[PDB]
Design an enzyme around this catalytic site. Structure first.
Site, PDB file in Angstrom:
ATOM      1  N   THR A   1       6.098  24.293  11.356  1.00  0.00           N
ATOM      2  CA  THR A   1       4.857  22.862  11.706  1.00  0.00           C
ATOM      3  C   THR A   1       4.458  23.025  13.216  1.00  0.00           C
ATOM      4  OG1 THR A   1       7.319  21.646  11.102  1.00  0.00           O
ATOM      5  CG2 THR A   1       4.808  19.775  12.177  1.00  0.00           C
TER       6      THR A   1
ATOM      7  N   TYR B   1       8.412  14.182   3.090  1.00  0.00           N
ATOM      8  CA  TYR B   1       7.524  12.622   1.962  1.00  0.00           C
ATOM      9  C   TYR B   1       8.663  12.281   0.119  1.00  0.00           C
ATOM     10  CZ  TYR B   1       3.775  10.318  -0.396  1.00  0.00           C
ATOM     11  OH  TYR B   1       2.929   9.483  -1.592  1.00  0.00           O
TER      12      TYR B   1
ATOM     13  N   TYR C   1      16.960  22.818   8.893  1.00  0.00           N
ATOM     14  CA  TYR C   1      15.656  21.877  10.087  1.00  0.00           C
ATOM     15  C   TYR C   1      15.753  20.481   9.985  1.00  0.00           C
ATOM     16  CZ  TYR C   1      11.342  20.537  12.882  1.00  0.00           C
ATOM     17  OH  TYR C   1      10.262  20.445  13.537  1.00  0.00           O
TER      18      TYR C   1
ATOM     19  N   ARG D   1       9.466  13.036  11.052  1.00  0.00           N
ATOM     20  CA  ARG D   1       8.365  13.715  10.180  1.00  0.00           C
ATOM     21  C   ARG D   1       8.355  13.651   8.365  1.00  0.00           C
ATOM     22  NH1 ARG D   1       4.948  15.710  13.990  1.00  0.00           N
ATOM     23  NH2 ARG D   1       3.955  17.314  12.657  1.00  0.00           N
TER      24      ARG D   1
ATOM     25  N   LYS E   1      18.412  23.296  13.038  1.00  0.00           N
ATOM     26  CA  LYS E   1      17.203  22.937  14.406  1.00  0.00           C
ATOM     27  C   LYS E   1      17.685  21.472  14.551  1.00  0.00           C
ATOM     28  CE  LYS E   1      13.075  22.998  15.149  1.00  0.00           C
ATOM     29  NZ  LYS E   1      11.489  23.259  15.256  1.00  0.00           N
TER      30      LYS E   1
ATOM     31  N   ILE F   1      14.686  25.855  19.584  1.00  0.00           N
ATOM     32  CA  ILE F   1      12.931  26.213  18.805  1.00  0.00           C
ATOM     33  C   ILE F   1      11.676  25.371  19.793  1.00  0.00           C
ATOM     34  CG2 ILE F   1      12.135  27.019  16.909  1.00  0.00           C
ATOM     35  CD1 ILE F   1      14.380  26.980  15.465  1.00  0.00           C
TER      36      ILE F   1
END
Ligand SMILES: NCCCC[C@@](N)(CC[C@](N)(CCCCN)C(=O)O)C(=O)O
Ligand SMILES: [Mg+2]
Lengths: 296, 296
Positions: B45, B109, B135, B140, B164, B205
């Site tokens: 990202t 989404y 992740y 998001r 993560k 990260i």
């Protein structure tokens, strides 16, 4: 401005052996035409746009455009992307493949700023001739197109004529139409179709219409004619199915419902989408029998 | 299990006149290696993966693997997608351009169910040999990978070795490590790096690592070596920049900071990503002043 309003359907995309059942698709779109729908939305979220290939996306726009030729039913093609260059391309593709307009979702995941959302949509708006309907669904995108940005784009770009709202925010729809009443507010939340239409909304883009297009059709036209009592009556009758269609993420319940009604052949999704639990399958299957489901 | 842990940097992707500045990319990766970083995460990202070309992603992995050859720095490749068929592909690609492992974000989404998330990640894991780090960033993606789903994937697929976390949910990281303490929990939230490490997390990260890789390195190693006092000391000092680096959506502030520090040549984004406000620009440039910024 050119506009696309009324009762509209976010088309499911049926799969047979992992491929787009094109004949099922055309038969479902015709089922929509014959049940009072004013426009069909191919390759949107409900159509599992995320997991389709460009030839499948392009093919299903073509199937929609061709099936609609000879009717007043317009094709509002799904053409959104979290990458501006790809969103401009898909806008051009739909425009060059015969779509009457495009529905363009806010970029998802990469959370652009309000300034970034404006430049994204202006890039699309300046790239094609067809009407462009903004699509705001923050629960799926991670971003919201604020009231300011929606109105600015409506006033700065001629092709942008309104926004499909899936915000569960009646306050924002007052806010929107109170400051810019020339815009076309479209309901993207079936359960609150009437409350949005009652405040000046001029249409819906419905998931529920996939199974009961006649009732979504009747609700919208009752409402557009200011027969608010009849519009609210259908809205109230539809509440149970409007909710159950979101027992799991769209389009998992509606495709389950479509299969149960025998309107598609197989209950297939493309991963990461999958058939619902056995419980929700039973819940979807039960609520259905309280409604009269039209066939072909 | 094979694992990739420690201090990791989600690399920004510099653009010069709309193209990926290859040498700066390699030059920035070198700056990381010589400043104590244990692994670099390309085209995540923070690298604007959403708006990148497969040819840009592929080259940035190649640049990443080639620059860390000969050091002990690992390449944890960004390889996620909201379409499993696309995510499975990127896993294979990353393995063949030499990446030591992949970071695979939860589908965005389309909101897959927990069952769909299991089958999505199970499909990826069964497709490659290299370690796979889940992740989770619900803000998001629109979706959360539940603790149960994370642990099941960890126990059922050999290469899936941890996750993560970017949920601002220290509760969930207790839940994770208390029921599955063999997992590698990685911080994806710079401001709370130490609290995650302090509960047994084995790496971060980082976005801040782009600008202050020496301090992110030291914090992570102090914590992994159980010097919690020195680990918190850097964490507390870093708070102001850890926050301002998200005054606007990542990577807008960090690329602004990198440019202001003279570590990249142009302040270019790919749309819908955008230069920050003049206000936030002053906030990023001002908070910066306070830290000692490594050069080349
Ligand atoms: N109708 C086709 C949909 C496929 C595209 C995509 N799966 C991912 C979109 C994408 N912009 C692709 C990026 C590929 C690497 N740059 C994304 O994952 O961000 C999505 O929009 O959901
Ligand atoms: Mg009439």
């Amino acid at each position: 401005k050119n506009i696309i309003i009324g009762a509209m359907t976010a088309l499911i995309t049926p799969f047979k052996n992992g491929k787009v059942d094109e004949q099922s698709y055309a038969r479902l779109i015709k089922r929509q035409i014959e049940n009072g729908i004013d426009a069909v939305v191919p390759v949107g979220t409900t159509g599992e746009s995320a997991t389709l290939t460009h030839e499948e996306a392009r093919t299903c726009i073509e199937i929609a455009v061709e099936t609609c030729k000879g009717t007043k039913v317009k094709v509002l093609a799904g053409a959104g992307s979290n990458a501006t260059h790809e969103a401009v391309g898909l806008a051009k593709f739909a425009k060059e493949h015969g779509a009457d307009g495009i529905l363009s979702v806010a970029p998802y995941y990469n959370k652009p700023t309000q300034q970034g959302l404006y430049e994204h949509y202006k890039a699309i708006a300046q790239s094609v001739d067809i009407p462009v309907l903004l699509y705001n669904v923050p629960g799926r995108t991670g971003c919201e197109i604020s009231t300011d940005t929606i109105i600015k784009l409506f006033r700065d770009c001629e092709n942008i004529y309104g926004v499909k709202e899936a915000s569960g925010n009646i306050d924002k729809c007052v806010d929107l139409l109170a400051h810019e009443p020339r815009m076309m507010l479209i309901s993207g939340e079936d359960a609150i179709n009437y409350p949005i239409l009652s405040n000046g909304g001029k249409g819906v883009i419905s998931v529920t219409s996939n199974l009961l297009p006649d009732m979504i059709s009747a609700l919208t036209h009752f409402a557009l004619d200011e027969n608010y009592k009849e519009a609210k009556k259908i809205n109230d009758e539809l509440y149970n199915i409007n909710k159950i269609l979101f027992c799991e993420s769209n389009p998992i319940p509606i495709k389950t419902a479509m299969y149960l009604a025998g309107l598609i052949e197989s209950l297939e999704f493309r991963l990461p989408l999958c058939s619902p639990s056995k419980e929700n399958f039973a819940k979807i299957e039960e609520v259905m029998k309280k409604y009269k489901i039209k066939g072909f």
